[PDB]
Amino acid sequence: GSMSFIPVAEDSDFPIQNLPYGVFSTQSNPKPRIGVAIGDQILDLSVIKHLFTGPALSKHQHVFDETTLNNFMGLGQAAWKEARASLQNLLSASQARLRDDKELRQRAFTSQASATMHLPATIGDYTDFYSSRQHATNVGIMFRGKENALLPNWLHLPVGYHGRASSIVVSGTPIRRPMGQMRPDNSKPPVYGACRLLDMELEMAFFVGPGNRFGEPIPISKAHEHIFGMVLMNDWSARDIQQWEYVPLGPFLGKSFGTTISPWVVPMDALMPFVVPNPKQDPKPLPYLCHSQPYTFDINLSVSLKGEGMSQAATICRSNFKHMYWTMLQQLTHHSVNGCNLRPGDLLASGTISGSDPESFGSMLELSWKGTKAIDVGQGQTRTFLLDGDEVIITGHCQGDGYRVGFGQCAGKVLPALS
Amino acid sequence: MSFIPVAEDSDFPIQNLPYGVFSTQSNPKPRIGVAIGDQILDLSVIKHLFTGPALSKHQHVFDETTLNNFMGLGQAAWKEARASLQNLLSASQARLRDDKELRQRAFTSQASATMHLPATIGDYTDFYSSRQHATNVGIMFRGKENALLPNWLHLPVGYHGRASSIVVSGTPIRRPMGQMRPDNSKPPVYGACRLLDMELEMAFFVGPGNRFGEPIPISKAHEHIFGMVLMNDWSARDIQQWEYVPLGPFLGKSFGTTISPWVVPMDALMPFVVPNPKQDPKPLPYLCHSQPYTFDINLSVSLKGEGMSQAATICRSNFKHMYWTMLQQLTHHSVNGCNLRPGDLLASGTISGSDPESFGSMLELSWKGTKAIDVGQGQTRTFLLDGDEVIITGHCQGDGYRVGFGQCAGKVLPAL
Ligand SMILES: [Ca+2]
Ligand SMILES: [Ca+2]
Ligand code: NI
């Protein structure tokens, strides 16, 4: 194990083994600033930036002064590793530098309870992949049937689409049920009204570090050098609006009304201890998508739902990121194979995370099986899709011996449509 | 009219006055300028000349490296800026004409300026509003009987595009590598795209946005449309075909999308507005508007290949061939609460008229490579060859003057 001079509860999401990056502000200071979570506190990086005396950061301390993590993300792995090593030393229970500097320590730390979290970065482009095999299979069965579940290209490339960047909001942001066009009756023209099949989608997403030049693909051998860290994501969906609009150009308004992400970006370095061998792929992908480097992660995911009249939230999904068929390396490589330029701060999501066990399906569309099964949310109460006032909270964590690497919350409450 | 000499056939008379971002050899810093004649009026140099109610306390927007903040100010600010510019360029407010010291610092020639992207595009969206285009593609994919999909006549279908790869006119475009499936009975192959194509489009920039969760009523849609630019949505058809179902165009589009530098203000385009195309069935009330918002903009596309001395005009079309208006597109885009932001770019989708000479893509012009396009000098084309340069131009014809868009050019580089 390892210990910080800052007290850390055994089940805390933020032990010294984690050290996630976030943007926060406080009642005392409205300026959004970069911080690192440790225990129940936040270490203000702008206050201690002068302590980053290493080669990679000494002339780049200004990145810790920014209102977003973009510049830090754009520095690259040498900088990330140096920052992490510095923080591990400084927060160490045996290191005196910060521990014994009473005045520095006083203005460098703030309680997480006092902080308002903001989006970690300015996202230039958001991309949603569709890499969970059971998810695509489930949707396939409902749409086409048991026999033609997966479409021809699924096993050959990590299919994905460009999402809406503007509507990616931080955990805690209320999400209003969307108005739009839908076609409930095929024998009648479409109608305008409030979404009737509001859903959540359990996902995880990673931020891009240094980008690639316009026109220059990122070789899969170098893909890992561009992955900064991860966050939890709830890709809120309006299924009825989506179904009517999506053919042939893809998900659009049924997705863009809101997408929530957790605030704390857990660095890839903190997740490496939980890496496991990649799933066997058959057919074997083309050479450009082939890599031996293990890059599949054992991250326990959970989703709870709490109706406005409920006192206790019901856990409706227990899944794991290790189910994913295509890795983040294959996704990033594929995303740049044509020359597309990924940039620092870009966000690439996994797609709904569903395992084979029905208990691990990552969307109410799957859990209620298209509204044909009731989801048990605690006696006297059931659900098919989201009701106004419902709060959905996604959490996740890696379990180590005597410690865990957690992500904090990815929450949102449904507000009534303007109807 | 204007103290700056303006050739009659100029794209930039005093009736145009587009906004753009430029830099020069003497000053590499991207700054805002307005095209007039063959010159550029540096707005950062004359920012103090905007003394009106809407701009006097916001002159800083003309000091920015992008037009976002100016776009974000809204219509009252845009109208005032235009009026100030028109008065200054006519000597009615003789400050600029007579102040030699200022004047010599305010103007620079377009020929020696380096143009940049007009704004930082937070989100790019590509609509599919040209009926003949959708119909042609439908005929090629499904057949005439199932040309248009069920939802086409009911809503302005569109998809989120890739913002990062939107490049300014003149940027070389690399033929993309990717996966293709030339033989459905065999696995996909990896290689250089073989069906490289262009797509004639026009796009508008968003002004003030709307708050997250708050739709923009169609009645107010016109208040959020800043101006327009030409666009070439480069496409790798064979890569696109294999990847697009069911999530949409992806790598077949994101390797590059070119736009012209000069943003023509909507106010400059109003004199060329024409009646909106009759829609049957009539759209749902939220998409209804009687205000005419269809525009007569002549568009032209040329192609010049390696070894060819002259470019051949392969397409002559018009922006008036759009079934769904920009007002309906903007409204539909925010109906669910999605927050449009200053600088966002919403494109029309490939523009095609009913006449084959007006089809906006080589996919259509060569009808899926079944017809050879005559590009002159004894040469033909189905799809783009390495070395081919495509240049899109556009203009509105007024009485004695024309509102032009400059160029939206790009040359194809061999695959890496
Ligand atoms: Ca999704
Ligand atoms: Ca297009
Ligand atoms: Ni130990």
Side-chain angles (χ1 to χ4, degrees), chain A, chain B residues 2-416:
Chain A
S2 227
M3 239 63 246
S4 168
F5 60 83
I6 296 291
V8 174
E10 178 170 23
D11 283 348
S12 172
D13 276 350
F14 317 109
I16 195 164
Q17 290 94 338
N18 189 350
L19 306 179
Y21 300 93
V23 174
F24 73 101
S25 59
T26 54
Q27 288 159 317
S28 60
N29 179 353
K31 186 208 162 266
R33 53 195 182 278
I34 299 165
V36 168
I38 175 69
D40 69 357
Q41 305 286 119
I42 297 175
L43 174 59
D44 191 327
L45 298 196
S46 64
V47 173
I48 62 149
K49 63 187 170 182
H50 64 286
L51 295 183
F52 292 117
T53 57
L57 304 171
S58 66
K59 299 184 177 190
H60 293 104
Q61 298 175 352
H62 66 77
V63 303
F64 300 113
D65 259 348
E66 312 291 346
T67 56
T68 59
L69 291 167
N70 298 66
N71 294 353
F72 178 51
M73 291 172 173
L75 289 184
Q77 59 182 3
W80 306 340
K81 295 184 180 181
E82 186 173 290
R84 186 175 182 68
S86 288
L87 290 165
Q88 294 174 309
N89 182 52
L90 286 169
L91 290 171
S92 182
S94 57
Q95 174 56 245
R97 184 55 189 94
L98 177 55
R99 184 194 68 200
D100 297 336
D101 194 321
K102 188 178 172 187
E103 93 82 38
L104 182 61
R105 208 181 142 159
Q106 184 161 65
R107 57 190 169 81
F109 289 99
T110 302
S111 166
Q112 279 163 29
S114 305
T116 295
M117 304 303 301
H118 300 278
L119 269 190
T122 293
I123 308 167
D125 277 300
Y126 151 45
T127 300
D128 198 31
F129 286 93
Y130 199 49
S131 311
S132 170
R133 185 169 190 164
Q134 192 65 47
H135 179 67
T137 301
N138 285 341
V139 174
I141 296 167
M142 300 179 178
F143 247 138
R144 298 172 280 288
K146 328 262 176 173
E147 315 173 352
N148 302 310
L150 291 179
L151 292 161
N153 62 7
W154 205 89
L155 295 170
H156 302 284
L157 55 85
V159 309
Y161 65 96
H162 313 292
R164 180 75 187 183
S166 73
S167 52
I168 288 165
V169 289
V170 75
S171 185
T173 301
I175 304 296
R176 206 175 278 288
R177 176 179 301 270
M179 298 295 289
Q181 231 191 89
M182 316 92 97
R183 198 185 198 168
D185 191 330
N186 240 316
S187 311
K188 290 191 165 188
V191 295
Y192 164 79
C195 166
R196 293 183 180 254
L197 310 172
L198 187 54
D199 199 4
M200 65 79 51
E201 287 195 332
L202 168 66
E203 302 198 26
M204 287 200 79
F206 68 90
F207 282 103
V208 171
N212 54 299
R213 290 181 177 184
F214 176 74
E216 305 184 0
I218 296 176
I220 193 160
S221 57
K222 298 192 171 186
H224 72 282
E225 300 177 355
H226 301 270
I227 308 182
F228 179 84
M230 305 189 74
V231 295
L232 304 168
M233 171 184 285
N234 179 345
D235 185 10
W236 305 94
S237 317
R239 307 298 190 185
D240 48 358
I241 289 174
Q242 185 179 10
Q243 193 172 359
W244 175 231
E245 83 184 346
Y246 99 101
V247 180
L249 310 184
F252 192 50
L253 297 179
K255 313 300 291 187
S256 65
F257 65 97
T259 298
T260 305
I261 61 169
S262 54
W264 295 110
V265 187
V266 173
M268 290 316 302
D269 282 338
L271 296 170
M272 294 312 310
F274 306 96
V275 78
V276 294
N278 305 313
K280 170 186 183 175
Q281 294 184 303
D282 182 23
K284 180 180 179 176
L286 286 164
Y288 86 101
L289 290 173
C290 193
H291 75 264
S292 52
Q293 176 178 16
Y295 217 81
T296 294
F297 301 84
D298 189 345
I299 310 176
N300 302 279
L301 298 168
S302 191
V303 180
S304 69
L305 181 161
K306 188 184 189 178
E308 60 183 5
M310 293 173 40
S311 285
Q312 182 173 8
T315 298
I316 63 179
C317 171
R318 277 175 177 99
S319 203
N320 197 297
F321 193 58
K322 74 186 180 187
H323 300 323
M324 303 310 284
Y325 194 81
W326 295 96
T327 70
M328 293 184 264
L329 301 187
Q330 298 176 302
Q331 295 171 337
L332 187 128
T333 295
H334 183 66
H335 204 147
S336 57
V337 76
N338 67 345
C340 179
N341 55 325
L342 294 177
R343 302 186 296 190
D346 279 355
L347 192 61
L348 282 60
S350 57
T352 311
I353 305 174
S354 289
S356 55
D357 177 12
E359 167 182 83
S360 69
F361 289 175
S363 71
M364 297 171 76
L365 168 68
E366 292 164 275
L367 294 166
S368 73
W369 204 258
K370 210 173 170 192
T372 67
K373 293 187 178 183
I375 297 170
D376 190 348
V377 294
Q379 262 191 21
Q381 311 187 66
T382 64
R383 289 283 185 289
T384 42
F385 288 91
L386 291 166
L387 299 187
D388 291 342
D390 280 355
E391 181 176 61
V392 176
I393 302 179
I394 297 173
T395 46
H397 77 276
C398 296
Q399 187 63 61
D401 168 47
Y403 77 93
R404 73 194 243 148
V405 168
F407 288 77
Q409 295 185 332
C410 172
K413 185 174 180 176
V414 179
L415 290 181
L418 298 175
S419 54
Chain B
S2 177
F3 71 81
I4 287 289
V6 178
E8 335 190 80
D9 53 1
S10 179
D11 274 2
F12 315 111
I14 191 168
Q15 292 87 351
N16 186 355
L17 304 177
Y19 302 99
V21 173
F22 75 104
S23 64
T24 55
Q25 35 135 73
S26 60
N27 188 175
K29 167 118 167 184
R31 55 201 178 271
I32 299 160
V34 171
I36 178 62
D38 62 6
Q39 302 296 107
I40 296 179
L41 176 51
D42 196 333
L43 299 197
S44 66
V45 171
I46 67 163
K47 66 183 171 300
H48 56 291
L49 295 183
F50 296 98
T51 59
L55 295 171
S56 64
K57 310 294 177 172
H58 297 97
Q59 300 174 349
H60 69 83
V61 301
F62 300 121
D63 242 18
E64 308 294 340
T65 56
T66 61
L67 285 161
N68 296 66
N69 291 351
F70 180 51
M71 294 173 166
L73 289 183
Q75 65 188 357
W78 309 334
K79 292 174 185 295
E80 184 182 291
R82 181 175 184 76
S84 293
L85 289 168
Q86 291 186 307
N87 288 335
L88 289 169
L89 290 170
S90 76
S92 174
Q93 287 293 295
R95 188 53 179 255
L96 186 53
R97 185 191 68 189
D98 302 325
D99 192 333
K100 182 174 170 178
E101 192 283 326
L102 181 62
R103 185 170 168 172
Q104 294 189 341
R105 284 186 303 116
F107 295 95
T108 197
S109 70
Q110 296 163 18
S112 51
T114 300
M115 303 302 305
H116 302 257
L117 285 172
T120 301
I121 303 162
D123 279 299
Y124 151 48
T125 298
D126 196 39
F127 287 92
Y128 201 39
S129 309
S130 184
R131 192 172 184 158
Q132 195 63 52
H133 175 72
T135 299
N136 285 347
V137 175
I139 294 171
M140 294 182 11
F141 263 116
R142 302 173 277 288
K144 67 174 183 183
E145 179 184 5
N146 296 277
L148 291 182
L149 290 160
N151 65 9
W152 206 94
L153 295 169
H154 293 104
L155 45 65
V157 302
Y159 67 97
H160 311 295
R162 178 78 190 175
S164 72
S165 49
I166 293 177
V167 294
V168 73
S169 192
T171 307
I173 305 300
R174 283 268 181 213
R175 173 179 302 269
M177 299 275 286
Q179 258 189 59
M180 299 149 285
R181 199 189 195 175
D183 191 330
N184 283 308
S185 65
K186 285 91 182 203
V189 296
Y190 166 70
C193 140
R194 297 194 178 209
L195 305 186
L196 187 61
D197 196 8
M198 55 89 37
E199 285 196 329
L200 171 68
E201 307 200 13
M202 283 199 84
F204 70 92
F205 280 100
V206 170
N210 55 301
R211 297 180 187 187
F212 174 79
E214 306 191 0
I216 295 171
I218 188 156
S219 178
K220 294 187 181 174
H222 71 282
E223 299 177 7
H224 301 269
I225 302 179
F226 180 84
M228 306 186 77
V229 293
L230 304 171
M231 174 184 281
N232 179 351
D233 185 14
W234 304 97
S235 321
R237 308 295 191 183
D238 47 346
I239 290 177
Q240 189 178 356
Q241 190 176 14
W242 174 231
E243 81 184 347
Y244 99 109
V245 181
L247 306 186
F250 193 49
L251 298 187
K253 314 299 297 187
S254 64
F255 62 93
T257 301
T258 304
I259 62 168
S260 48
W262 296 108
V263 191
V264 177
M266 287 312 305
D267 278 2
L269 302 171
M270 287 309 312
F272 309 94
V273 70
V274 294
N276 298 321
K278 177 184 179 179
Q279 297 180 303
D280 181 6
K282 287 189 184 184
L284 284 160
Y286 85 100
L287 294 166
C288 191
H289 73 90
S290 50
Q291 175 182 356
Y293 215 82
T294 294
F295 302 80
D296 192 342
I297 312 180
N298 303 281
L299 297 164
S300 189
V301 183
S302 67
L303 180 161
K304 180 186 177 167
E306 234 174 60
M308 275 174 59
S309 67
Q310 287 298 33
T313 303
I314 61 171
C315 173
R316 284 183 166 189
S317 199
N318 198 294
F319 190 56
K320 67 182 176 175
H321 308 130
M322 294 300 295
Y323 195 78
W324 295 100
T325 67
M326 292 182 267
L327 305 190
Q328 290 170 313
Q329 292 170 339
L330 184 120
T331 297
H332 185 63
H333 206 152
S334 55
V335 70
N336 66 343
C338 179
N339 58 320
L340 299 178
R341 298 187 299 196
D344 278 356
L345 193 58
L346 284 62
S348 62
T350 315
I351 302 167
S352 296
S354 50
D355 188 317
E357 130 177 322
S358 76
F359 292 172
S361 70
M362 296 171 77
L363 176 61
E364 295 162 274
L365 294 158
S366 74
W367 208 253
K368 191 61 176 182
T370 60
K371 299 181 177 189
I373 304 168
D374 192 346
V375 299
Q377 306 187 46
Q379 288 198 41
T380 63
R381 288 295 187 284
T382 41
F383 289 89
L384 294 162
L385 301 186
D386 293 340
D388 282 358
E389 177 176 67
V390 176
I391 303 176
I392 299 176
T393 52
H395 80 280
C396 288
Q397 190 59 63
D399 288 326
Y401 72 98
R402 74 195 239 137
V403 172
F405 288 78
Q407 302 182 335
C408 178
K411 184 175 175 176
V412 178
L413 290 176
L416 237 34

Coordinates of all heavy atoms in Angstrom, one line a residue, chain B residues 124 126-127 159 199 201 233 235 253 349-350, ligand 2:
Chain B
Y124 N -19.9 21.4 -35.6 CA -20.3 21.5 -37.0 C -21.4 20.5 -37.3 O -21.3 19.4 -36.8 CB -19.0 21.3 -37.9 CG -19.3 20.7 -39.3 CD1 -20.2 21.2 -40.2 CD2 -18.5 19.5 -39.7 CE1 -20.5 20.6 -41.4 CE2 -18.7 18.9 -40.9 CZ -19.7 19.5 -41.8 OH -20.0 18.8 -43.0
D126 N -24.0 18.9 -40.4 CA -24.2 18.9 -41.9 C -25.6 18.4 -42.1 O -26.0 17.3 -41.8 CB -23.2 17.9 -42.5 CG -23.2 18.1 -44.0 OD1 -23.2 19.3 -44.5 OD2 -23.1 17.1 -44.8
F127 N -26.5 19.3 -42.7 CA -27.8 18.9 -43.0 C -27.9 18.2 -44.3 O -26.8 18.0 -44.9 CB -28.8 20.1 -42.9 CG -29.1 20.6 -41.5 CD1 -28.3 21.6 -40.9 CD2 -30.1 20.0 -40.8 CE1 -28.5 21.9 -39.6 CE2 -30.3 20.3 -39.4 CZ -29.5 21.3 -38.8
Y159 N -26.6 15.5 -39.5 CA -25.7 14.7 -38.6 C -24.6 15.6 -38.0 O -24.3 16.6 -38.7 CB -25.1 13.5 -39.2 CG -24.1 13.7 -40.3 CD1 -22.8 13.7 -40.1 CD2 -24.6 14.1 -41.6 CE1 -21.8 14.0 -41.1 CE2 -23.6 14.3 -42.6 CZ -22.3 14.3 -42.3 OH -21.4 14.6 -43.3
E199 N -18.2 17.8 -52.4 CA -19.6 18.1 -52.2 C -19.8 19.5 -52.0 O -19.3 20.2 -51.1 CB -20.1 17.3 -50.9 CG -20.3 15.8 -51.2 CD -21.1 15.2 -50.1 OE1 -21.1 15.6 -48.9 OE2 -21.8 14.2 -50.4
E201 N -21.4 22.7 -51.0 CA -22.3 23.1 -49.9 C -22.1 24.5 -49.6 O -21.2 25.2 -50.0 CB -22.0 22.2 -48.7 CG -22.0 20.7 -48.9 CD -22.3 20.0 -47.6 OE1 -22.6 20.5 -46.6 OE2 -22.1 18.7 -47.7
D233 N -17.4 19.6 -48.7 CA -17.4 18.5 -47.8 C -16.8 17.3 -48.5 O -17.5 16.4 -49.1 CB -18.8 18.1 -47.3 CG -18.9 17.1 -46.2 OD1 -17.8 16.7 -45.7 OD2 -19.9 16.6 -46.0
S235 N -15.3 13.9 -49.5 CA -15.9 12.5 -49.2 C -15.1 11.4 -49.8 O -14.7 11.4 -50.9 CB -17.3 12.4 -49.7 OG -18.0 13.7 -49.5
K253 N -15.9 11.2 -44.0 CA -16.1 12.7 -44.1 C -15.1 13.5 -43.3 O -14.7 14.6 -43.7 CB -17.5 13.0 -43.5 CG -18.7 12.2 -44.0 CD -18.9 12.3 -45.5 CE -19.3 13.7 -45.9 NZ -19.7 13.8 -47.3
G349 N -25.7 20.6 -46.8 CA -25.6 19.3 -47.3 C -25.4 19.6 -48.8 O -25.5 20.7 -49.3
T350 N -25.0 18.6 -49.6 CA -24.7 18.7 -51.0 C -25.9 19.4 -51.7 O -27.0 19.0 -51.6 CB -24.4 17.4 -51.6 OG1 -23.5 16.7 -50.8 CG2 -23.8 17.6 -53.0
Ligands
CA2 CA -22.1 16.5 -46.9

